[PDB]
Amino acid sequence: SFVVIIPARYASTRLPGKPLVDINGKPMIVHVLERARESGAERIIVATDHEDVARAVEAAGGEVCMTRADHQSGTERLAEVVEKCAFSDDTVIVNVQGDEPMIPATIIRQVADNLAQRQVGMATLAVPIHNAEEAFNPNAVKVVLDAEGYALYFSRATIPWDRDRFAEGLETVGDNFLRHLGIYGYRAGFIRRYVNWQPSPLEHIEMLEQLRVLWYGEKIHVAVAQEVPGTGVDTPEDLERVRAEM
Amino acid sequence: SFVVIIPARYASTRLPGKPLVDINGKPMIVHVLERARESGAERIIVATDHEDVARAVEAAGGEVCMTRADHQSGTERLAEVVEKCAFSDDTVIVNVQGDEPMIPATIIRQVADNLAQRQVGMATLAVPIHNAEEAFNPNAVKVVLDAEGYALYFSRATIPWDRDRFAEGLETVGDNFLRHLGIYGYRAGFIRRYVNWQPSPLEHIEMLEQLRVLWYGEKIHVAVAQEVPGTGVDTPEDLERVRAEM
Ligand SMILES: Nc1ccn([C@@H]2O[C@H](COP(=O)(O)OP(=O)(O)OP(=O)(O)O)[C@@H](O)[C@H]2O)c(=O)n1
Ligand SMILES: Nc1ccn([C@@H]2O[C@H](COP(=O)(O)OP(=O)(O)OP(=O)(O)O)[C@@H](O)[C@H]2O)c(=O)n1
Ligand SMILES: [Mg+2]
Ligand SMILES: [Mg+2]
């Protein structure tokens, strides 16, 4: 009932060659592949631009689609896979980012289901932040929601800003921050629409691909899950933490 | 063609008693009144909760409406004024905040005009920030817009966050920052709608009354003016600056 595509370019800047970094005997990309398998997805494809990533995935028995080196985000890379596989417009695609080796299968299913149950073009998920270090870390993307759960904005800045608390000091946070997880649900037809839009100025400043959608006035629904152990892997520090936790 | 209402409660927390602070021989509230007069507004009302504010305005020949002490924002206070004056729903109201003694008359007129020409419930304005101090100052409210100029979010946080520039240092900013001005255009019918909503959690965290509107899924249009003098008076530092510049 849904397809998972995992975008995994080699030349990440904050952690070069990250799809292939070892985590307890397997490259990160293979761990993400396993989360996708566990979700029950009908088809799972790794999209990459690098032969060494392709070989690792093929050796783990996963399907691979080679894609252009000049894509500027995972979602842009997905559109090439979508065109090559010729998915119907109504086919549900879940982008599980190659930097999320600990994302639970249940969360993958939840995003697909949430998307299919709403007339929204794109669905995603966030989890509460419980410590101030993460609230003030620009590598942890924060998201602020409206009353219906649609995203107002995603940012690397600390939003929503707590005026009175932070005027005092920056060492504590209340119970109102949300960390955005690297996963998106969207139908193939929406992915097509996404790459047909001209890039927003906003997405390039924050380096957050989802801002293109908000810029063109479309909604993103964000479900909130209370507990999800682990973290995405964007820095050397993230990698050490994940190595220890898995 | 429009009514100006200036909300001015006495007990500000960041600058106590600010409607009465001396700015070069006249209290701040009287300067705001003078800006409102210059706009050509058909009627101008200062809404206050304090007799000494009332007296300063009356001594300057201005109209005063006493209002409850328990209002939690200028917009809430304006609703009491709208009922007491029994304005019709379609009456165009411009909230010129009591902390904007330097706001140009042209900007006041522009917000009223923008509101009237659009199907939108609420209109406001922002000005490009070209210095790093204001961009990183939580007393300067930043806003990020969509392609059509509707607000995605308003925040005291530094948005949009420049990932690559700021990873290096906070010394400089690009050209992508907008400072929100303390002026709102809305019809009386919208003000009535605003206070029919239960308060949002979001507005209390940021201490930004306009966030109630985004929380409940309604739009705010933001015009951008390229050049606007002065600043909002919220801190002692702002007060020194406006005293030097007015
Ligand atoms: N041009 C890009 C950038 C990102 N991705 C993929 O999208 C996912 C999420 O992006 P991110 O974690 O930020 O990866 P990078 O962009 O590669 O890393 P960095 O931002 O540090 O440069 C990653 O699996 C990455 O491989 C992609 O396919 N093409
Ligand atoms: N409960 C409130 C708070 C604000 N205002 C008015 O709304 C305008 C903008 O608010 P702000 O500049 O923040 O004033 P204060 O809320 O009074 O100051 P502070 O946030 O420092 O406590 C001001 O003219 C203020 O008098 C109001 O009428 N009632
Ligand atoms: Mg990236
Ligand atoms: Mg205030």
Coordinates of C-alpha atoms and ligand atoms in Angstrom, one line a residue:
Chain A
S1 CA 0.0 0.0 0.0
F2 CA 3.0 2.4 0.0
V3 CA 6.5 2.7 -1.5
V4 CA 9.6 3.8 0.5
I5 CA 12.3 5.7 -1.3
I6 CA 15.5 6.5 0.7
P7 CA 17.6 9.4 -0.7
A8 CA 21.2 8.9 0.0
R9 CA 23.8 11.1 -1.7
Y10 CA 27.4 10.5 -0.8
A11 CA 28.8 14.1 -0.4
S12 CA 27.2 15.3 2.8
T13 CA 28.9 18.4 4.1
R14 CA 28.4 18.1 7.9
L15 CA 29.4 14.5 7.8
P16 CA 31.1 13.5 4.5
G17 CA 30.2 10.1 2.9
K18 CA 27.7 9.5 5.6
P19 CA 25.6 6.8 3.9
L20 CA 28.6 4.5 4.3
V21 CA 29.8 5.2 7.8
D22 CA 29.9 2.1 9.9
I23 CA 27.4 1.5 12.6
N24 CA 28.1 -1.7 14.5
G25 CA 29.2 -3.6 11.4
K26 CA 26.8 -2.2 8.8
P27 CA 26.8 1.1 6.9
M28 CA 24.2 3.6 8.0
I29 CA 22.3 3.3 4.7
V30 CA 21.7 -0.4 5.3
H31 CA 20.2 0.3 8.8
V32 CA 17.7 2.7 7.2
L33 CA 16.9 0.0 4.6
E34 CA 16.1 -2.3 7.5
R35 CA 13.7 0.2 9.1
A36 CA 12.0 0.4 5.7
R37 CA 11.7 -3.3 5.4
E38 CA 10.2 -3.5 8.9
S39 CA 7.5 -1.0 7.9
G40 CA 5.9 -3.4 5.5
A41 CA 6.4 -1.2 2.5
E42 CA 5.4 -2.9 -0.8
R43 CA 8.6 -1.6 -2.5
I44 CA 11.8 -0.1 -1.2
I45 CA 14.3 1.8 -3.3
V46 CA 17.5 3.6 -2.3
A47 CA 18.2 6.6 -4.5
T48 CA 21.9 7.5 -4.7
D49 CA 24.5 9.2 -6.9
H50 CA 27.5 7.1 -5.9
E51 CA 28.5 3.6 -7.0
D52 CA 30.0 2.7 -3.6
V53 CA 26.6 3.4 -2.0
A54 CA 24.8 1.4 -4.7
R55 CA 27.1 -1.6 -4.2
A56 CA 26.5 -1.6 -0.4
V57 CA 22.7 -1.5 -0.9
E58 CA 22.8 -4.2 -3.6
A59 CA 24.9 -6.4 -1.3
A60 CA 22.3 -6.1 1.3
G61 CA 19.7 -7.1 -1.3
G62 CA 18.0 -3.7 -1.7
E63 CA 16.8 -2.2 -4.9
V64 CA 18.9 0.9 -6.1
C65 CA 18.1 3.7 -8.5
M66 CA 21.1 5.8 -9.7
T67 CA 20.2 9.5 -9.9
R68 CA 21.7 12.8 -11.0
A69 CA 24.6 14.4 -9.0
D70 CA 23.0 17.8 -9.3
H71 CA 19.8 17.2 -7.2
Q72 CA 19.7 19.7 -4.3
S73 CA 17.6 17.7 -1.9
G74 CA 16.2 14.3 -1.1
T75 CA 12.8 15.3 -2.4
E76 CA 14.3 16.5 -5.7
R77 CA 16.1 13.2 -6.0
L78 CA 12.9 11.3 -5.3
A79 CA 11.2 12.9 -8.3
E80 CA 13.8 11.3 -10.6
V81 CA 13.0 7.9 -9.1
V82 CA 9.2 8.6 -9.4
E83 CA 9.6 9.4 -13.1
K84 CA 11.8 6.4 -13.8
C85 CA 9.4 3.9 -12.1
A86 CA 6.4 5.7 -13.6
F87 CA 4.3 5.5 -10.4
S88 CA 0.6 6.4 -10.7
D89 CA -0.2 9.9 -9.4
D90 CA -2.2 8.5 -6.4
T91 CA 0.6 6.1 -5.3
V92 CA 1.8 6.9 -1.7
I93 CA 5.5 7.5 -1.4
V94 CA 7.3 7.8 2.0
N95 CA 10.7 9.5 1.9
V96 CA 12.6 8.0 4.8
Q97 CA 15.8 10.1 4.9
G98 CA 19.1 8.2 4.7
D99 CA 20.1 10.0 8.0
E100 CA 17.4 8.2 10.1
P101 CA 18.8 4.8 11.0
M102 CA 16.7 4.6 14.2
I103 CA 13.3 5.6 13.0
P104 CA 10.8 3.0 14.0
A105 CA 8.8 1.0 11.5
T106 CA 5.6 2.1 13.3
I107 CA 6.4 5.7 12.6
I108 CA 7.0 4.9 8.9
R109 CA 3.5 3.3 8.7
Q110 CA 1.9 6.1 10.7
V111 CA 3.1 8.8 8.2
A112 CA 1.8 6.8 5.2
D113 CA -1.6 6.2 6.9
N114 CA -1.9 9.9 8.0
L115 CA -1.2 11.0 4.4
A116 CA -3.7 8.6 2.9
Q117 CA -6.4 9.6 5.5
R118 CA -6.2 13.3 4.8
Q119 CA -6.7 15.6 1.7
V120 CA -3.4 17.2 2.5
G121 CA -0.6 17.0 0.0
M122 CA 2.2 16.2 2.5
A123 CA 2.5 14.6 5.9
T124 CA 5.3 14.3 8.4
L125 CA 6.0 13.7 12.1
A126 CA 7.6 15.4 15.1
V127 CA 8.6 14.5 18.7
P128 CA 8.8 16.6 21.9
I129 CA 12.2 18.1 22.8
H130 CA 12.9 17.7 26.5
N131 CA 16.3 19.3 26.9
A132 CA 17.6 22.8 26.2
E133 CA 20.7 21.8 24.4
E134 CA 18.6 20.3 21.6
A135 CA 16.2 23.2 21.6
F136 CA 19.1 25.6 20.8
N137 CA 20.9 23.3 18.4
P138 CA 20.5 24.4 14.7
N139 CA 21.0 20.9 13.5
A140 CA 17.8 19.9 15.3
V141 CA 15.0 21.3 13.2
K142 CA 12.1 22.8 15.2
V143 CA 8.5 23.0 14.0
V144 CA 5.6 25.1 15.2
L145 CA 2.0 23.9 14.6
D146 CA -1.4 25.5 14.2
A147 CA -4.5 24.3 16.1
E148 CA -5.2 21.6 13.5
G149 CA -1.7 20.2 13.5
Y150 CA -0.5 21.8 10.2
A151 CA 3.0 23.4 10.2
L152 CA 3.1 27.1 10.5
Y153 CA 6.9 27.1 10.0
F154 CA 10.0 24.8 10.3
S155 CA 13.3 26.4 11.4
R156 CA 16.8 25.8 12.7
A157 CA 16.1 28.7 15.1
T158 CA 14.6 28.1 18.5
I159 CA 10.8 28.4 17.8
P160 CA 8.4 29.1 19.4
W161 CA 10.6 31.6 21.3
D162 CA 9.7 31.7 25.0
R163 CA 10.0 35.5 25.6
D164 CA 9.8 35.6 29.4
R165 CA 11.8 32.4 30.2
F166 CA 14.6 33.2 27.7
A167 CA 14.9 36.9 28.9
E168 CA 16.0 35.3 32.2
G169 CA 18.4 32.7 30.7
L170 CA 18.9 30.0 28.1
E171 CA 19.5 26.9 30.3
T172 CA 15.9 25.5 30.6
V173 CA 12.9 25.0 28.3
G174 CA 9.3 24.3 29.0
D175 CA 7.3 21.4 27.4
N176 CA 6.4 23.0 24.1
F177 CA 9.3 22.4 21.6
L178 CA 9.0 19.8 18.8
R179 CA 11.8 18.2 16.8
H180 CA 11.0 17.4 13.2
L181 CA 11.8 13.9 12.1
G182 CA 13.4 13.2 8.6
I183 CA 10.4 11.5 7.0
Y184 CA 7.8 12.7 4.5
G185 CA 4.7 11.1 3.1
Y186 CA 3.4 12.4 -0.3
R187 CA 1.7 11.0 -3.3
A188 CA 3.8 10.6 -6.5
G189 CA 1.7 13.4 -8.2
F190 CA 2.6 15.8 -5.4
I191 CA 6.3 15.0 -5.8
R192 CA 5.9 15.9 -9.5
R193 CA 4.3 19.2 -8.5
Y194 CA 7.1 19.9 -6.0
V195 CA 9.9 19.7 -8.6
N196 CA 7.9 21.7 -11.1
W197 CA 7.9 24.7 -8.7
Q198 CA 10.8 27.1 -8.9
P199 CA 12.9 26.8 -5.8
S200 CA 11.9 29.2 -2.9
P201 CA 14.5 31.7 -1.6
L202 CA 13.5 30.5 1.9
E203 CA 14.5 26.8 1.4
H204 CA 18.1 27.8 0.5
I205 CA 18.5 30.1 3.5
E206 CA 17.4 27.6 6.2
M207 CA 18.5 24.6 4.1
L208 CA 15.1 23.0 4.7
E209 CA 13.5 21.5 1.6
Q210 CA 10.0 21.4 3.1
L211 CA 9.9 25.2 3.2
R212 CA 9.2 25.1 -0.6
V213 CA 5.8 23.7 0.1
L214 CA 4.9 26.4 2.7
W215 CA 6.2 29.1 0.4
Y216 CA 3.8 28.1 -2.3
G217 CA 0.9 28.1 0.2
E218 CA 0.3 24.4 0.5
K219 CA -0.2 22.6 3.9
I220 CA 1.9 20.0 5.6
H221 CA 0.3 18.0 8.4
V222 CA 2.5 17.1 11.3
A223 CA 1.6 14.3 13.6
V224 CA 3.3 14.3 17.1
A225 CA 4.6 11.0 18.6
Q226 CA 5.4 11.1 22.3
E227 CA 8.4 8.8 22.4
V228 CA 11.0 8.0 19.8
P229 CA 14.5 7.0 21.0
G230 CA 17.6 8.0 19.1
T231 CA 18.2 10.9 16.7
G232 CA 19.0 11.7 13.1
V233 CA 22.6 11.5 12.0
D234 CA 23.9 14.8 10.7
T235 CA 27.1 15.4 12.6
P236 CA 30.1 13.5 14.0
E237 CA 28.5 13.9 17.4
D238 CA 25.2 12.4 16.3
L239 CA 27.1 9.4 14.9
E240 CA 28.8 8.7 18.2
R241 CA 25.5 8.9 20.0
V242 CA 23.7 6.6 17.6
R243 CA 26.7 4.1 17.6
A244 CA 26.2 3.9 21.4
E245 CA 22.4 3.6 21.3
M246 CA 21.9 1.0 18.6
Chain B
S1 CA -12.4 56.1 5.6
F2 CA -10.8 54.6 8.7
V3 CA -10.6 54.8 12.5
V4 CA -7.3 54.7 14.4
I5 CA -7.3 53.2 17.9
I6 CA -4.1 53.4 19.9
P7 CA -4.0 50.9 22.8
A8 CA -1.8 52.2 25.7
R9 CA -1.9 50.4 29.0
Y10 CA 0.2 51.8 31.8
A11 CA 1.9 48.8 33.3
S12 CA 4.5 47.6 30.6
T13 CA 7.0 45.2 32.1
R14 CA 10.1 45.9 29.9
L15 CA 9.6 49.7 30.3
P16 CA 7.3 50.6 33.2
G17 CA 4.7 53.4 32.6
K18 CA 5.9 53.8 29.0
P19 CA 3.0 55.7 27.5
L20 CA 4.0 58.6 29.8
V21 CA 7.8 58.4 29.3
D22 CA 9.2 61.8 28.2
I23 CA 10.5 62.0 24.6
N24 CA 12.0 65.4 24.1
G25 CA 9.2 67.4 25.8
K26 CA 6.1 65.3 25.1
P27 CA 5.1 61.9 26.5
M28 CA 5.3 58.9 24.0
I29 CA 1.5 58.5 23.8
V30 CA 1.2 62.1 22.5
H31 CA 3.8 61.5 19.8
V32 CA 1.8 58.5 18.6
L33 CA -1.4 60.6 18.6
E34 CA 0.5 63.1 16.4
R35 CA 1.4 60.4 13.9
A36 CA -2.2 59.3 13.8
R37 CA -3.4 62.8 13.2
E38 CA -1.0 63.1 10.3
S39 CA -2.5 60.0 8.7
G40 CA -5.8 61.8 8.1
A41 CA -7.9 59.3 10.0
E42 CA -11.5 60.2 10.4
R43 CA -11.5 59.4 14.2
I44 CA -8.6 58.7 16.6
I45 CA -9.1 57.1 20.0
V46 CA -6.5 56.3 22.7
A47 CA -7.6 53.2 24.6
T48 CA -6.1 53.2 28.1
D49 CA -6.6 51.7 31.6
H50 CA -5.0 54.6 33.5
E51 CA -6.2 58.0 34.4
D52 CA -2.8 59.7 34.0
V53 CA -2.6 58.4 30.4
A54 CA -6.1 59.7 29.8
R55 CA -5.1 63.2 31.1
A56 CA -2.0 63.5 29.0
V57 CA -4.1 62.6 25.9
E58 CA -6.9 64.9 26.8
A59 CA -4.5 67.8 27.5
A60 CA -3.3 67.3 23.9
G61 CA -6.9 67.5 22.6
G62 CA -7.2 63.8 21.9
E63 CA -10.1 61.4 22.5
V64 CA -9.8 58.7 25.2
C65 CA -11.7 55.5 25.9
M66 CA -11.2 54.0 29.3
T67 CA -11.0 50.2 29.2
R68 CA -10.6 47.2 31.5
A69 CA -7.4 46.6 33.2
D70 CA -7.6 42.8 32.6
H71 CA -7.1 42.9 28.8
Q72 CA -4.0 40.9 27.8
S73 CA -3.1 42.6 24.5
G74 CA -3.9 45.7 22.5
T75 CA -6.1 43.8 20.1
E76 CA -8.2 42.5 23.1
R77 CA -8.4 46.1 24.4
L78 CA -9.6 47.3 21.0
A79 CA -12.6 45.0 21.1
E80 CA -14.0 46.8 24.2
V81 CA -13.6 50.1 22.3
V82 CA -15.3 48.7 19.2
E83 CA -18.3 47.7 21.4
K84 CA -18.5 50.9 23.3
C85 CA -18.5 52.9 20.1
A86 CA -20.8 50.4 18.5
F87 CA -18.9 50.4 15.2
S88 CA -20.4 48.4 12.4
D89 CA -18.6 45.2 11.3
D90 CA -17.2 46.7 8.1
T91 CA -15.6 49.7 9.8
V92 CA -11.9 49.7 9.0
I93 CA -9.8 50.0 12.2
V94 CA -6.1 50.6 12.3
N95 CA -4.3 49.6 15.6
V96 CA -1.4 51.9 15.8
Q97 CA 0.4 50.6 18.9
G98 CA 1.4 53.0 21.6
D99 CA 5.0 51.9 21.3
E100 CA 5.4 53.4 17.7
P101 CA 6.0 57.1 18.2
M102 CA 8.0 57.4 14.9
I103 CA 5.7 55.5 12.5
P104 CA 5.1 57.5 9.3
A105 CA 1.6 58.7 8.5
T106 CA 2.0 57.1 5.0
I107 CA 2.5 53.7 6.6
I108 CA -0.7 54.1 8.7
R109 CA -2.7 55.0 5.5
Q110 CA -1.1 52.2 3.6
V111 CA -2.2 49.5 6.0
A112 CA -5.8 50.7 6.0
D113 CA -5.7 50.7 2.1
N114 CA -4.1 47.3 1.9
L115 CA -6.7 45.8 4.2
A116 CA -9.6 47.4 2.3
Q117 CA -8.3 46.2 -1.1
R118 CA -7.9 42.5 0.0
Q119 CA -10.3 39.8 1.0
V120 CA -8.0 39.1 4.0
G121 CA -9.2 39.6 7.6
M122 CA -6.0 41.3 8.8
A123 CA -3.1 43.3 7.3
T124 CA 0.2 44.5 8.6
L125 CA 3.6 45.7 7.4
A126 CA 7.3 44.9 7.8
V127 CA 10.6 46.6 6.9
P128 CA 13.9 45.0 5.7
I129 CA 16.5 44.7 8.4
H130 CA 20.0 45.6 7.4
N131 CA 22.0 45.3 10.6
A132 CA 22.9 42.2 12.7
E133 CA 21.9 43.7 16.0
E134 CA 18.2 43.9 15.2
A135 CA 18.2 40.5 13.6
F136 CA 19.4 38.8 16.8
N137 CA 17.4 41.0 19.2
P138 CA 14.3 39.2 20.6
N139 CA 12.6 42.5 21.2
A140 CA 12.6 43.0 17.4
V141 CA 9.9 40.7 16.0
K142 CA 10.9 38.9 12.7
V143 CA 8.4 37.7 10.2
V144 CA 8.8 35.2 7.3
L145 CA 6.4 35.4 4.3
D146 CA 5.0 33.1 1.7
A147 CA 5.2 33.9 -2.1
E148 CA 1.9 35.9 -1.9
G149 CA 3.1 37.9 1.1
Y150 CA 1.0 36.2 3.8
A151 CA 2.8 35.6 7.1
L152 CA 4.0 32.0 7.6
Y153 CA 5.1 32.9 11.2
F154 CA 6.2 35.8 13.4
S155 CA 8.8 35.2 16.0
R156 CA 11.3 36.7 18.4
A157 CA 13.7 34.1 17.2
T158 CA 16.1 34.9 14.4
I159 CA 14.1 33.7 11.4
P160 CA 14.7 32.7 8.7
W161 CA 17.8 31.1 10.1
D162 CA 20.8 31.2 7.7
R163 CA 22.3 27.7 8.3
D164 CA 25.6 28.2 6.4
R165 CA 26.3 31.8 7.3
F166 CA 25.5 31.4 11.0
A167 CA 27.4 28.2 11.4
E168 CA 30.5 30.4 10.8
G169 CA 29.5 33.3 13.0
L170 CA 26.8 35.7 14.0
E171 CA 28.7 38.8 12.8
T172 CA 26.7 39.5 9.6
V173 CA 23.3 39.0 7.9
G174 CA 22.1 38.7 4.4
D175 CA 19.2 40.5 2.9
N176 CA 16.4 38.1 4.0
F177 CA 15.3 39.6 7.4
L178 CA 12.0 41.5 8.0
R179 CA 11.1 43.5 11.1
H180 CA 7.4 43.5 11.9
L181 CA 6.0 47.0 12.7
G182 CA 3.5 47.5 15.5
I183 CA 0.5 48.4 13.3
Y184 CA -2.5 46.3 12.4
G185 CA -5.4 46.8 10.0
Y186 CA -8.6 44.9 10.6
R187 CA -12.4 45.5 10.2
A188 CA -14.3 45.7 13.5
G189 CA -16.0 42.5 12.5
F190 CA -12.6 40.8 12.6
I191 CA -11.7 42.3 16.0
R192 CA -15.0 40.8 17.2
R193 CA -14.0 37.4 15.7
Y194 CA -10.5 37.6 17.4
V195 CA -11.9 37.9 20.9
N196 CA -14.5 35.1 20.2
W197 CA -11.5 32.7 20.0
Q198 CA -10.2 31.2 23.2
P199 CA -6.5 32.3 23.7
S200 CA -3.9 30.2 21.9
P201 CA -1.0 28.6 23.8
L202 CA 1.3 30.0 21.1
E203 CA 0.5 33.7 21.7
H204 CA 1.5 33.4 25.3
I205 CA 4.8 31.7 24.7
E206 CA 6.1 34.2 22.2
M207 CA 4.0 37.1 23.7
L208 CA 2.9 38.0 20.2
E209 CA -0.9 38.6 20.0
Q210 CA -1.0 38.1 16.2
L211 CA -0.1 34.5 16.6
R212 CA -3.7 33.7 17.7
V213 CA -4.8 34.4 14.1
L214 CA -2.3 31.9 12.6
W215 CA -3.0 29.4 15.3
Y216 CA -6.7 29.3 14.2
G217 CA -5.7 29.0 10.6
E218 CA -6.5 32.4 9.2
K219 CA -4.3 34.6 7.1
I220 CA -2.4 37.8 7.7
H221 CA -1.1 39.8 4.8
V222 CA 2.2 41.6 5.2
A223 CA 3.2 44.4 2.9
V224 CA 6.9 45.3 2.9
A225 CA 8.0 48.9 3.0
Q226 CA 11.6 49.4 1.9
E227 CA 12.4 52.4 4.2
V228 CA 10.8 53.2 7.6
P229 CA 12.5 55.5 10.2
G230 CA 12.8 54.9 13.9
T231 CA 12.0 51.8 16.0
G232 CA 9.4 50.5 18.4
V233 CA 9.9 51.6 22.0
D234 CA 10.0 48.5 24.2
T235 CA 13.2 48.8 26.2
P236 CA 15.2 51.5 27.9
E237 CA 17.7 51.2 25.0
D238 CA 15.0 51.8 22.4
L239 CA 13.9 54.9 24.5
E240 CA 17.4 56.4 24.4
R241 CA 17.5 55.8 20.6
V242 CA 14.2 57.4 19.9
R243 CA 15.1 60.4 22.2
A244 CA 18.3 60.8 20.2
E245 CA 16.5 60.5 16.8
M246 CA 13.1 62.1 17.1
Ligands
LIG1 N1 21.5 17.2 -2.4 C1 21.0 16.3 -1.6 C2 21.0 16.5 -0.2 C3 20.4 15.6 0.6 N2 20.0 14.4 0.1 C4 19.6 13.3 1.0 O1 18.6 13.8 1.9 C5 18.7 13.2 3.2 C6 18.6 14.3 4.2 O2 19.5 15.4 4.0 P1 20.8 15.7 5.0 O3 20.7 14.8 6.2 O4 20.9 17.1 5.3 O5 22.0 15.1 4.1 P2 23.1 16.0 3.3 O6 22.5 17.2 2.6 O7 23.8 15.1 2.4 O8 24.1 16.5 4.5 P3 24.6 18.1 4.7 O9 23.3 19.0 4.9 O10 25.3 18.0 6.0 O11 25.4 18.6 3.6 C7 20.1 12.6 3.2 O12 19.9 11.2 3.3 C8 20.8 12.9 1.9 O13 21.5 11.9 1.4 C9 20.0 14.1 -1.3 O14 19.5 13.1 -1.8 N3 20.5 15.1 -2.1
LIG2 N1 -2.2 43.9 28.1 C1 -1.9 44.8 27.2 C2 -0.6 44.8 26.7 C3 -0.3 45.7 25.6 N2 -1.1 46.7 25.3 C4 -0.7 47.7 24.4 O1 -0.3 47.1 23.2 C5 0.8 47.9 22.7 C6 1.9 47.0 22.2 O2 2.3 46.2 23.3 P1 3.7 46.3 24.0 O3 4.6 47.3 23.2 O4 4.4 45.0 24.2 O5 3.4 47.0 25.5 P2 3.4 46.2 26.9 O6 2.6 44.9 26.8 O7 2.6 47.1 27.8 O8 4.9 46.1 27.3 P3 5.7 44.7 27.8 O9 5.5 43.6 26.7 O10 7.1 45.1 28.0 O11 5.1 44.2 29.1 C7 1.3 48.9 23.7 O12 1.0 50.2 23.4 C8 0.5 48.5 25.0 O13 0.1 49.6 25.7 C9 -2.4 46.7 25.9 O14 -3.2 47.5 25.5 N3 -2.8 45.8 26.8
MG3 MG 21.3 18.7 3.7
MG4 MG 3.6 43.4 25.4

